[PDB]
Amino acid sequence: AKYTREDIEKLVKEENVKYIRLQFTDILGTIKNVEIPVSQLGKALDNKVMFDGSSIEGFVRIEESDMYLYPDLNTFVIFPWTAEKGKVARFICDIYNPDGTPFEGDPRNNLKRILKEMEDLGFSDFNLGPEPEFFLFKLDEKGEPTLELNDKGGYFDLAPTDLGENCRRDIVLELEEMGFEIEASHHEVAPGQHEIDFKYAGAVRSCDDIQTFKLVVKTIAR
Amino acid sequence: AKYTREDIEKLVKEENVKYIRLQFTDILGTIKNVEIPVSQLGKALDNKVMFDGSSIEGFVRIEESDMYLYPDLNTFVIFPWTAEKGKVARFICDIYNPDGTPFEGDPRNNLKRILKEMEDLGFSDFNLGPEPEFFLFKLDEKGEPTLELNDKGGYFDLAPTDLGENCRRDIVLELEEMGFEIEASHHEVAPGQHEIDFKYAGAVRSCDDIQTFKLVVKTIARKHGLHATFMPKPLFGVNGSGMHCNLSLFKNGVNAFFDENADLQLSETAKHFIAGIVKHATSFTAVTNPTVNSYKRLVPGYEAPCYVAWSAQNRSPLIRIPASRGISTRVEVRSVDPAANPYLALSVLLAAGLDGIKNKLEAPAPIDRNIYVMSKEERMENGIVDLPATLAEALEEFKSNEVMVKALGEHLFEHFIEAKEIEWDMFRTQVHPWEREQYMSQY
Amino acid sequence: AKYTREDIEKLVKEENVKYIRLQFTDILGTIKNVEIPVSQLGKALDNKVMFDGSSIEGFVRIEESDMYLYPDLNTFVIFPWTAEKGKVARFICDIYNPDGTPFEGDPRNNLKRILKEMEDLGFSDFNLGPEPEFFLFKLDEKGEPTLELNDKGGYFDLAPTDLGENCRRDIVLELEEMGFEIEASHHEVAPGQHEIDFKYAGAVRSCDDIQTFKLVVKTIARKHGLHATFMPKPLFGVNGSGMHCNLSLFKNGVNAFFDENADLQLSETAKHFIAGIVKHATSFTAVTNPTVNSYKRLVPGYEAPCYVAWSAQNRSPLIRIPASRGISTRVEVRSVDPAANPYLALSVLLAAGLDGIKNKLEAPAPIDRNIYVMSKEERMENGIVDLPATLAEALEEFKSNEVMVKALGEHLFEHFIEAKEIEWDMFRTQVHPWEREQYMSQY
Numbered sequence A: 001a002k003y004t005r006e007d008i009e010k011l012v013k014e015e016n017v018k019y020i021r022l023q024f025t026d027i028l029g030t031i032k033n034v035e036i037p038v039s040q041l042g043k044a045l046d047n048k049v050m051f052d053g054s055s056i057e058g059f060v061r062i063e064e065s066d067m068y069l070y071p072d073l074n075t076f077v078i079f080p081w082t083a084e085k086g087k088v089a090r091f092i093c094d095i096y097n098p099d100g101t102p103f104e105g106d107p108r109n110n111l112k113r114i115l116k117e118m119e120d121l122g123f124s125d126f127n128l129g130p131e132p133e134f135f136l137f138k139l140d141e142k143g144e145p146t147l148e149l150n151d152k153g154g155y156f157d158l159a160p161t162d163l164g165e166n167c168r169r170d171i172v173l174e175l176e177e178m179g180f181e182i183e184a185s186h187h188e189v190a191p192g193q194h195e196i197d198f199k200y201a202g203a204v205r206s207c208d209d210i211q212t213f214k215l216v217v218k219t220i221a222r
Numbered sequence B, C: 001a002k003y004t005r006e007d008i009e010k011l012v013k014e015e016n017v018k019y020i021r022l023q024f025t026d027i028l029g030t031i032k033n034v035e036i037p038v039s040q041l042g043k044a045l046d047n048k049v050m051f052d053g054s055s056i057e058g059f060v061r062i063e064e065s066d067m068y069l070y071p072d073l074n075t076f077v078i079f080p081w082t083a084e085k086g087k088v089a090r091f092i093c094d095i096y097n098p099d100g101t102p103f104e105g106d107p108r109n110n111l112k113r114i115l116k117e118m119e120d121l122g123f124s125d126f127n128l129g130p131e132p133e134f135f136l137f138k139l140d141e142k143g144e145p146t147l148e149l150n151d152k153g154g155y156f157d158l159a160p161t162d163l164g165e166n167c168r169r170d171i172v173l174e175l176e177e178m179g180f181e182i183e184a185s186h187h188e189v190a191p192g193q194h195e196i197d198f199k200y201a202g203a204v205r206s207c208d209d210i211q212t213f214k215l216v217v218k219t220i221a222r223k224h225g226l227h228a229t230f231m232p233k234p235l236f237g238v239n240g241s242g243m244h245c246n247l248s249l250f251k252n253g254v255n256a257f258f259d260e261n262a263d264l265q266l267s268e269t270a271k272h273f274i275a276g277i278v279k280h281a282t283s284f285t286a287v288t289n290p291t292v293n294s295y296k297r298l299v300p301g302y303e304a305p306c307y308v309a310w311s312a313q314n315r316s317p318l319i320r321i322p323a324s325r326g327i328s329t330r331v332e333v334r335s336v337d338p339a340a341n342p343y344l345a346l347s348v349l350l351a352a353g354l355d356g357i358k359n360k361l362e363a364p365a366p367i368d369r370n371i372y373v374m375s376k377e378e379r380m381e382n383g384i385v386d387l388p389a390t391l392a393e394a395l396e397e398f399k400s401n402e403v404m405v406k407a408l409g410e411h412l413f414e415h416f417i418e419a420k421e422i423e424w425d426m427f428r429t430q431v432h433p434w435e436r437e438q439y440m441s442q443y
């Protein structure tokens, strides 16, 4: 759809991507990834990059732990905060057993199944508009979180009172460079609470966006 | 021959190499080196630079100290982190005695001898793909190691949780500039644990690369305020670091382990090889796991081998055969740790697997199970043998085995055992704080 | 025939005893007790006092936990330091099951049974003279021990260098008043180490004394703001603590070990007995040195045994025969340490001794030198065997000896190995600071 193998191969050149991150989600929803140099691109596109399935919550057992990664070409995105020292592009992947059959405990794959039940009932799109709110806490000299909120502002508050204005300003900028359609940005009701909103999309793409957003938020807050 | 004298003389000019390092490995696996002004290149390429052999662990003695360094032209490499103050090219060297003859106590030379036995069995390449895991700890304000991990992340974790991402990315940059072929990098299971992988090469070049890697990891880590350690189990309760050895044989430029039409697509040769590794397993553990600490990693529940058995795609035995086939068919030996002298670990693993082949030994039934959870009685019913439980226990199995002892040779074997006996003894006579916590108020 | 129920009821009234302590010993040798007001004396003297045997190391299990206490009348003793606020008399007790039969797992009971095998061979009594050394550490402001030794004195040192005269002086006062025959008191070889000797008694009374002794030392030491410990080897490089066991067999009330017309004035029984000890030595060591730390004392150079041999007036072998003869002729077994359970150590030493006499075994030639300064060669040529070098080796040896295993009984044997196998496993998997100092930087 969006991209073909050859599109990706060409994009990778024009952008001077140096490393590819293969990412996926475990059963708890926590994003996981491995980094490979761009020279391994053909290996990843061949569904040849493997991993220890027993080292990921909710996957396979150690007796049969080998597991394969099948990147979804349509999920190609460059991480702006990495260009300066080694530009990275990520792919979100489906999980496959070593025999060629899809892994039945892959949460992203299971969602595709319920989507097929949607199709056979006549619908062509299930759209999601996620609004994942977050708090911001102050780190200490040892970069560890404390329980001190970034500010004591409330809903829709303006700076001096809202002190997360710049953080959420930088976040919004990373997302926009990564293709997000940001819709709104503000301080939420509780002290140290923030919301950034983005346009809905297809259910799978939208779950891919939630995992991408959480990552970019935590990164820029740091 | 990759490079010739003339190539190296021209590389040095057109690259402005200001200093040369002559490196080699001691018996414990420690990188050693001397640096000379590039004006001394002729002296060194004439095998004329000398050093004090009685100051390198397990080499010669003080009455006959003089020893010589003979650079191997194919290991010529430049260190990127030195270029701005004074560019440095390294040579890995072989040790020779003053009378022109190779030193029989050089770990690298020994590996070459075992590789010639391979050539006589008809094989033409022994590929090793090493995967040496390491931890990162924070330096204090005096540049010294502390006990604080660099982070509390886990397997394949992403940054905020993974904080080694930048250090790893800087390690991968130096290795890539140095010609390494990087395959992957990631946070490993325990907190502050990491792995960078790279393509397999011939036995000698792969050990050379294990040596260069440990060096480049420790250096770059230090620039980011960290201390990298390949110590096997630095902390109780979490995973230890392994140095898995992916082994394969080539014959005619083809993976002799792959058989298109055969059980698991493993050829008979692969099966005899596995039969060899299995037979001598308990015997070469002392060499593949040479520190007291090594035996604290060899305990069930941490994805480290503690029972001799093989299996496909199974991360609990001594030998996993990964699901890859074709040119990537390989026997992965998961016992080796990154404290092992890579040159001597391959010598003993090559000899074991060449034993199985040349005597067509029969491989055992694979255990397709989580060996860690299978009961005592049940694993002795399958002939499952436990690995040695301490370095002293491992040294005793090693002494008892002629083919492994021959694999090291007299000098290596005599020195290796003496050094390990000293170490074990120190350890065993120390009174540890643990003992005081357990007994000082109780008794 | 020391005290009868009527004696006890009378003493209690005349001495104005206000509470009664019923004490016993668990499988590790740890003293245990419950206290009851003197109004419950009758309940206790009727063997009706119960306890949770499921909560005492090595006894019974949770679903069968009810156990009973049977005071042994002849162990009545008043603790003087308790007389000011509420005078306390104690009784040592035997553990019984709720059906009325003795408990098979009770260490003291077990020593009785081996003593009955001594009677069957015709001996009136088995005398033990314990000398269990200890160290004094300074307490801090929280009442917790530190690693500061109370003084930096040495053997037989005088006060100011010896700052232990105060405390020992008070220990001796309590003991003399509780009825001990004290024989000597002094600073011992290592900094902060002390010895207080007391007259031998019959094995059962001697083990009761050792328990009462460790109790009184620790108490009086705390009153001087010191922590007393019987840990075998609190610190590397200085002497450990022993609990030398002076053994002897009497017959018709006469020392069976003395024979003035014999060589060394050692009788045949002595010689046979010593042969019994030497034979089972490497086998009973797990019992007489039951901790991990025990094996750190069992190194050469510290006046602790290393090697199975015996000699007169020599402090380097496993068995020393002191100069004194006549009623004092005795075999001193220096391997035992003060972490041993006194009942089980006597039980295994008696069993070994009695095997020697029963089969009239022939003693080895005494090794009349400093075993420490003998080479590996010399020792082999003399048939000198090494003691087990870790708790794990001692356990394996102990298991393969039917006569030692049977000295313990089924319940004790089985529960001992279980507890020490567990203990050893904790120790072996532990990663010690040493390992980090050695390897964390080197690798």
Ligand SMILES: Nc1ncnc2c1ncn2[C@@H]1O[C@H](COP(=O)(O)OP(=O)(O)O)[C@@H](O)[C@H]1O
Pocket: A127, A128, A129, A130, A131, A183, A184, A197, A198, A199, A200
């Ligand atoms: N047809 C639709 N289906 C699903 N989501 C939609 C649709 N139209 C809009 N949305 C999304 O719903 C979300 C509403 O967010 P927001 O503007 O924060 O709402 P609220 O009014 O709750 O604050 C946005 O992500 C928006 O893109």
Ligand SMILES: Nc1ncnc2c1ncn2[C@@H]1O[C@H](COP(=O)(O)OP(=O)(O)O)[C@@H](O)[C@H]1O
Pocket: A050, A051, A052, B127, B128, B129, B130, B131, B183, B197, B198, B199, B200, B244, B246, B247, B248, B255, B322, B327, B328, B329, B330, B332
């Ligand atoms: N034929 C071969 N012989 C030896 N090693 C090989 C061969 N093919 C691949 N390898 C190596 O095996 C190693 C496997 O590393 P990795 O991919 O981390 O393994 P895993 O799947 O164990 O996590 C790599 O260094 C790889 O280059």
Ligand SMILES: Nc1ncnc2c1ncn2[C@@H]1O[C@H](COP(=O)(O)OP(=O)(O)O)[C@@H](O)[C@H]1O
Pocket: C127, C128, C129, C130, C131, C183, C197, C198, C199, C200, C244, C246, C247, C248, C255, C322, C327, C328, C329, C330, C332
């Ligand atoms: N016949 C005997 N049997 C057992 N022990 C005895 C006998 N005679 C003396 N002893 C004891 O042996 C121990 C010797 O202690 P000590 O005088 O400190 O000996 P050493 O000479 O080892 O320093 C004392 O407890 C003493 O009562």
Ligand SMILES: C[S@](=O)(CC[C@H](N)C(=O)O)=NP(=O)(O)O
Pocket: A052, A055, B131, B133, B188, B189, B239, B240, B241, B242, B243, B244, B297, B302, B303, B304, B305, B315, B334
């Ligand atoms: C996560 S693992 O199976 C962890 C292995 C462990 N560190 C060890 O060998 O001690 N390593 P890999 O998947 O790279 O083979």
Ligand SMILES: C[S@](=O)(CC[C@H](N)C(=O)O)=NP(=O)(O)O
Pocket: C131, C133, C188, C189, C239, C240, C241, C242, C243, C244, C297, C302, C303, C304, C305, C315, C334
């Ligand atoms: C001074 S000594 O040989 C010191 C003995 C040492 N404590 C040990 O047995 O480990 N004891 P003793 O003379 O009382 O028999």
Ligand SMILES: [Mg+2]
Pocket: A131, A195, A197
């Ligand atoms: Mg909203």
Ligand SMILES: [Mg+2]
Pocket: A131, A133, A188, A195
């Ligand atoms: Mg909201």
Ligand SMILES: [Mg+2]
Pocket: B131, B195, B197
């Ligand atoms: Mg790997």
Ligand SMILES: [Mg+2]
Pocket: B131, B133, B188, B195
């Ligand atoms: Mg790994």
Ligand SMILES: [Mg+2]
Pocket: B131, B244, B332
């Ligand atoms: Mg591996």
Ligand SMILES: [Mg+2]
Pocket: C131, C195, C197
């Ligand atoms: Mg004494």
Ligand SMILES: [Mg+2]
Pocket: C131, C133, C188, C195
């Ligand atoms: Mg003494």
Ligand SMILES: [Mg+2]
Pocket: C131, C244, C332
């Ligand atoms: Mg003594």
